[PDB]
Amino acid sequence: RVSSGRDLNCVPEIADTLGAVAKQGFDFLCMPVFHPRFKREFIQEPAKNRPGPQTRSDLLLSGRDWNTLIVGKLSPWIRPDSKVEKIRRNSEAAMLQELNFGAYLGLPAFLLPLNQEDNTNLARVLTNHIHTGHHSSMFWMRVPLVAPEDLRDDIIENAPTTHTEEYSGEEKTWMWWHNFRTLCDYSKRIAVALEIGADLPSNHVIDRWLGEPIKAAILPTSIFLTNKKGFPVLSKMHQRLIFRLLKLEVQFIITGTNHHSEKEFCSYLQYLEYLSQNRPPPNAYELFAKGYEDYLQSPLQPLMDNLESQTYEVFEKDPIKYSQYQQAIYKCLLDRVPEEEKDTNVQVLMVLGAGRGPLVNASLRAAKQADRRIKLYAVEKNPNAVVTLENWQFEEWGSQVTVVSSDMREWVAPEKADIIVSELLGSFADNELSPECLDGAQHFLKDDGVSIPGEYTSFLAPISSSKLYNEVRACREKDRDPEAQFEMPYVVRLHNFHQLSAPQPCFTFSHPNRDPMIDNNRYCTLEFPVEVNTVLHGFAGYFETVLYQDITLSIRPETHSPGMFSWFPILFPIKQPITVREGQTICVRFWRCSNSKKVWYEWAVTAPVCSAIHNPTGRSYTIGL
Amino acid sequence: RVSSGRDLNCVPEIADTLGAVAKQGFDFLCMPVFHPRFKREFIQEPAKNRPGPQTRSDLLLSGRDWNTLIVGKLSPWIRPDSKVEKIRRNSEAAMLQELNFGAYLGLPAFLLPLNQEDNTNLARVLTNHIHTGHHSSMFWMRVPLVAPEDLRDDIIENAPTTHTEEYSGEEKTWMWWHNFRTLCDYSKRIAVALEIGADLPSNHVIDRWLGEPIKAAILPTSIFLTNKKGFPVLSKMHQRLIFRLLKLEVQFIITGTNHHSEKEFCSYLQYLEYLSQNRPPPNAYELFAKGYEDYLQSPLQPLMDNLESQTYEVFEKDPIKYSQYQQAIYKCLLDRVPEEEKDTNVQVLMVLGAGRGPLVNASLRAAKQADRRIKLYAVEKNPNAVVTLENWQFEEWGSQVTVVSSDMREWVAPEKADIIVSELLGSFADNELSPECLDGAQHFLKDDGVSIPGEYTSFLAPISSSKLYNEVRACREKDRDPEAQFEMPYVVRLHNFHQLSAPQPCFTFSHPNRDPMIDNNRYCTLEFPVEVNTVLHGFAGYFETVLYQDITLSIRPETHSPGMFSWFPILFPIKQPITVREGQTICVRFWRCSNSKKVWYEWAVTAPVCSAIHNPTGRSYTIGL
Ligand SMILES: O=C(NCc1ccc(F)cc1)[C@@H]1c2ccccc2C(=O)N1Cc1cc2ncccc2[nH]1
Ligand SMILES: O=C(NCc1ccc(F)cc1)[C@@H]1c2ccccc2C(=O)N1Cc1cc2ncccc2[nH]1
Ligand SMILES: CSC[C@H]1O[C@@H](n2cnc3c(N)ncnc32)[C@H](O)[C@@H]1O
Ligand SMILES: CSC[C@H]1O[C@@H](n2cnc3c(N)ncnc32)[C@H](O)[C@@H]1O
Numbered sequence A, B: 001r002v003s004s005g006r007d008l009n010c011v012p013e014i015a016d017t018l019g020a021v022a023k024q025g026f027d028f029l030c031m032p033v034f035h036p037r038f039k040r041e042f043i044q045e046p047a048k049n050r051p052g053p054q055t056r057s058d059l060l061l062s063g064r065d066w067n068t069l070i071v072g073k074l075s076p077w078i079r080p081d082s083k084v085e086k087i088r089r090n091s092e093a094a095m096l097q098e099l100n101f102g103a104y105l106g107l108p109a110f111l112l113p114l115n116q117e118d119n120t121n122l123a124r125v126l127t128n129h130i131h132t133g134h135h136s137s138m139f140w141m142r143v144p145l146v147a148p149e150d151l152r153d154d155i156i157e158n159a160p161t162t163h164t165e166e167y168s169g170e171e172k173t174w175m176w177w178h179n180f181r182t183l184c185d186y187s188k189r190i191a192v193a194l195e196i197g198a199d200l201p202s203n204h205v206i207d208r209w210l211g212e213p214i215k216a217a218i219l220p221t222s223i224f225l226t227n228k229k230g231f232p233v234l235s236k237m238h239q240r241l242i243f244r245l246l247k248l249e250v251q252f253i254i255t256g257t258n259h260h261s262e263k264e265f266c267s268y269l270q271y272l273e274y275l276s277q278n279r280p281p282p283n284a285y286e287l288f289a290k291g292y293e294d295y296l297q298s299p300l301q302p303l304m305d306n307l308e309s310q311t312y313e314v315f316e317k318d319p320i321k322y323s324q325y326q327q328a329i330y331k332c333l334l335d336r337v338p339e340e341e342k343d344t345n346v347q348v349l350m351v352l353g354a355g356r357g358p359l360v361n362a363s364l365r366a367a368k369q370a371d372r373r374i375k376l377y378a379v380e381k382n383p384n385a386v387v388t389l390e391n392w393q394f395e396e397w398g399s400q401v402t403v404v405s406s407d408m409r410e411w412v413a414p415e416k417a418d419i420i421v422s423e424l425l426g427s428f429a430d431n432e433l434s435p436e437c438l439d440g441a442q443h444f445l446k447d448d449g450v451s452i453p454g455e456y457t458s459f460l461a462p463i464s465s466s467k468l469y470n471e472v473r474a475c476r477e478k479d480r481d482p483e484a485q486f487e488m489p490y491v492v493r494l495h496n497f498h499q500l501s502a503p504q505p506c507f508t509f510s511h512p513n514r515d516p517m518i519d520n521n522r523y524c525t526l527e528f529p530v531e532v533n534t535v536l537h538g539f540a541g542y543f544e545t546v547l548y549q550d551i552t553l554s555i556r557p558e559t560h561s562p563g564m565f566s567w568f569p570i571l572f573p574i575k576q577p578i579t580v581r582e583g584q585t586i587c588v589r590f591w592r593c594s595n596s597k598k599v600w601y602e603w604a605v606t607a608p609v610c611s612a613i614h615n616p617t618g619r620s621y622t623i624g625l
Helices: A014-023 A063-069 A084-107 A120-130 A169-183 A203-207 A236-248 A268-279 A282-291 A309-316 A319-336 A359-369 A383-397 A434-442 A464-475 B012-021 B063-069 B085-105 B118-132 B170-182 B203-207 B236-249 B267-277 B283-287 B309-316 B319-336 B357-368 B381-399 B435-438 B466-475
Strands: A006-008 A029-032 A070-073 A109-113 A138-144 A190-196 A214-221 A251-255 A344-351 A373-380 A401-405 A417-422 A447-450 A455-464 A504-510 A520-528 A534-546 A552-554 A570-582 A585-594 A597-605 B004-007 B027-032 B070-073 B109-113 B137-142 B190-195 B214-220 B251-255 B346-352 B374-382 B401-405 B416-424 B445-452 B455-464 B502-512 B522-529 B535-544 B553-554 B568-579 B585-594 B598-607
Touching: A006 A434, A014 A063, A014 B063, A029 A063, A063 A070, A063 A138, A063 B309, A070 A084, A070 B070, A084 A120, A084 A268, A109 A534, A120 A169, A120 B357, A138 A169, A169 A190, A190 A359, A190 A417, A190 B109, A203 B445, A214 A236, A214 B455, A251 A268, A268 A455, A268 B401, A309 A383, A319 A344, A319 A359, A319 A447, A319 A552, A319 B455, A344 A359, A359 A373, A359 A383, A359 B170, A373 A383, A455 A520, A455 A552, A455 A570, A455 B568, A464 A534, A464 B466, A504 A520, A552 B109, A570 A597, A570 B027, B012 B063, B012 B381, B027 B203, B070 B085, B085 B118, B085 B267, B118 B170, B118 B401, B137 B170, B170 B190, B236 B267, B236 B522, B309 B381, B319 B346, B319 B357, B319 B553, B346 B357, B357 B374, B357 B381, B374 B381, B416 B435, B455 B522, B455 B568, B466 B535, B466 B568, B502 B522, B502 B585, B568 B598
Parallel strands: A006 A029, A006 A251, A029 A070, A070 A109, A109 A138, A138 A190, A190 A214, A214 A251, A344 A373, A344 A417, A373 A401, A417 A447, B004 B027, B004 B251, B027 B070, B070 B109, B109 B137, B137 B190, B190 B214, B214 B251, B346 B374, B346 B416, B374 B401, B416 B445
Antiparallel strands: A455 A504, A455 A534, A520 A585, A534 A552, A534 A570, A585 A597, B455 B502, B455 B535, B522 B585, B535 B553, B535 B568, B585 B598
């Protein structure tokens, strides 16, 4: 169930070593390419002219074995950031040699340590290697939760351990990582191998690593406790961490000797498997969403575009949503028609944007459970969907449903409606121009008429995700602005990220709109209190909607409708990441803009530092009217 | 074994129709989306306001069934290129409607006819649809081998059939296709469904379709003969055509009613299967190459780049090549050392570019079968490969082989060689700078010394491939010249192409070179007699090499070494396709250019029309010294 590897720094026979590792259930082996102690000279004679082979032969394994089962390791003597110029130059040449041999073998990954603050020259050499030749090999930066200096024993008489709470100082290993990857310009080839220590740090120090590209989690054998049976186990503190890591789907590496000598080495792995099986199983959301983690998708535009059959199909596959619509209409019918007027009053319902007719069906179910009379119109502009409606209407519905093939903003209604029902909401509520459409359909609502939904609100929350930032970056395309990808929202199941502050309401719309000169343009300033250090990369967007009274739908995490999986979150990126210190406020500004042809969003960060205004005049992103 | 479909123009029940088609062994079904006779008005009242559903519901099949099993068809009444303005405008609206419904359903393909010369407005509407929304749906242009007017029966009294040999006129259906796809600007979404007739045309008319994107081959039931048993079969003429088509891996569509009424409809398909099984099986080349058909790859540069382990691995997997090297060295040893000097004379061999040591081994085998003494040097610049050599040398070879880790152009030899052996040849012979390397290694050859290979020649041949042209086109990348992809060669297993003329020698090199001021720059003019009409898209490159005397290696099709699969052909594209009439000569000019840092090729067509000079100053492509 869980993908696991073995870290060794001693391999006397490469073929024999693998066999043992494989027999114990491990999937891969982290090991050296050159002997860790085999220090090499490249400048000074005579040692530079050392004869013989420099390492093992590539022939000792199959190409496939190298490609899938071996993870390389930089030699421990290689120190590119040494103060001694000789050691620097030698380590440079050695690092390139080892990396080049890694590429030669076609290794899937290669481990490099981050065990100090200054890794500038290390970064400079790695970046040079990445921009030389072609390879898909990953680089896993071995970085500890807690620096070695900060988890040493307090056994030096004239050098006591820091017994002071240093909030920023305890987060120092993240800053080592942050600086390294910034120097390397967020290479997608560079990821984290997070080394877990005996004493876990404070919670903030761990939360630091949320939204970071963690590919591996190194577990020393030393951190394992022993149970009554006499086999390796972990603390409740470490258990919760592994449970969190299992959600990120990282690969667990075991390092160090067998301290549980009486038992096998598989026992360590068996415990991780034990934890893997013993977790809360995926709900309807997590089961279905499984696969779309941090996958960027363009926001749907049902007005501008005609949605395909299989786009409507997946919408209809959300029974929670339509049961809510059914219940909303059911309640509205009872409120509008009393018991004494049950069979005198026929309510005129109008589904505005009927699609393949999930609402029409719900409107029929609602009227039947309420026991009230209704007259349905099914307005739909998409002519491909109208084919479905009319086939259904002829076969099933009948003359009670009048299928209209038109734009709701154009349609000349032969009758005014008591209720209008619509499903024109996206991930950011008004991102499908629901305001504009329902404003133009407002005229054929009765003066006392109802709209379902009656209200909707969009929410924003600042996020830190070096993964998602790096994902957006990669959406650069030919023949357009080099930074257009940062000035447009994305529908994405947010997974590897950190929500820096609680969501706050951005834009609200009420239907029917009774404010003279109905203006759908908006400008909203939000101040987000941040209680951690972090790197803002964008803003997660959510929404809530009031269908009728107490019947609502929501994708806001704290009020999320349970089971519903129709709407994924939206993401508004920023061009450049922004540093945020603990105590500082992130201040974002959001505009909703429009002309006669388009609607779009602009946005800007104003605190703690200013960003550029994103998407001015909808240059990078517009929503078609 | 063979992928087959069924063409119907009558589907009374879509669910029932599929079942029957599936039961007969067909993989998919070509069928209408709207009723073929259901003509629709879009302008004039009252018929434009026709009520009811316009076609069947998308719900009648599953999303997956639409996506994999159904191929759409344009309605027969739709004529976008009609002379009547009303019919034009109506057919425009109808064509878009049908295409849009195709996309809605998510059909993998959609058939449109090319049954006349002028399909300009048809092309204009299709191109508009392709550049609207997003879809991966293919468009199969139904185009006959022989136009309907040219295979009609000679039964009109006052209108006799053309009994004149019209070379250009018999190729008219290709010109219909050519014009259509040119208007549509070689869209990768547009392909050919080639309709086979009762009477096949002349051979030239068929050869016309070589190098065209044929995705389907439509076979009417009418073209099938009947055997003694009373079951459908084809002529020997059609058999050879199907055998040719099976190499292209097209999908065979059966159209028309069952003329073999007494038998099942599966019999037609069973015959295609019968042919599929009864073909010449793939040789060592075609077996291994299977997968790389028309796949563009960058030419390897072993000098500039250090080749990976698995790149050397695949080279070593060609036993025919090294057996030839073994035999070449074997012969040279016998010529250089007489029988009386068997154990007095030790020949100094030097493998220049030893890799992981396939030649060294061959040199050992050669000396053993010859029974002569040798002293080996193994010069190799790639330090990753030198690791393999030294491990081998310590374990197996010993002190007889002296592994040198150096550039051959730099290495100061402690002894002059009797033989130098090299493997520095690419697909175009000198494309790996074998001349430059062996020139710089020439000094440590004895005055009477031998080089293996002693000579090599490159060959060129003009080709027509709308597939390969369209493939190169797609290699456009960000942040470089928009047409850089056309000014660089590609290693490609040429499959869907047409060789327009016989290969001719381009560049030749001899080693050792004894011409004063050894200049490796070249300029070659080639005139290729073309005996067909066609569209030149580039130049296939091959090579031959003389290892010693009569021992050779070759990838030139007519003298190809049997079994050898180390070198694929090279392709030099041109920016713009060039029309060539039958009888005209294609005149190409090739330069080999260099400075102190780089070597590159430039090329230009001068007849029948001029092209631009490709790759001036190696702007788009250089080979690193
Ligand atoms: O967020 C989304 N769905 C989440 C999802 C869940 C499971 C799965 F397998 C794939 C995707 C869709 C969507 C999908 C793909 C690409 C874009 C989008 C998008 O803007 N959505 C929001 C959305 C749903 C919807 N329903 C009706 C009317 C308007 C609507 N607007
Ligand atoms: O043409 C080529 N090989 C054909 C091939 C066959 C089977 C297969 F599965 C994949 C590829 C290689 C090649 C492969 C890939 C990408 C580029 C090339 C290329 O320039 N080649 C020519 C070549 C072979 C070679 N051997 C030794 C010294 C110099 C050499 N130069
Ligand atoms: C169920 S997703 C929203 C649906 O409403 C439809 N729709 C959106 N805008 C309009 C409009 N202005 N008039 C009619 N239908 C619309 C879309 O085509 C889609 O079927
Ligand atoms: C077998 S592919 C050609 C081999 O020759 C090697 N080679 C190419 N040019 C030189 C050179 N100038 N000196 C030494 N080896 C070379 C390459 O590194 C490769 O291993």
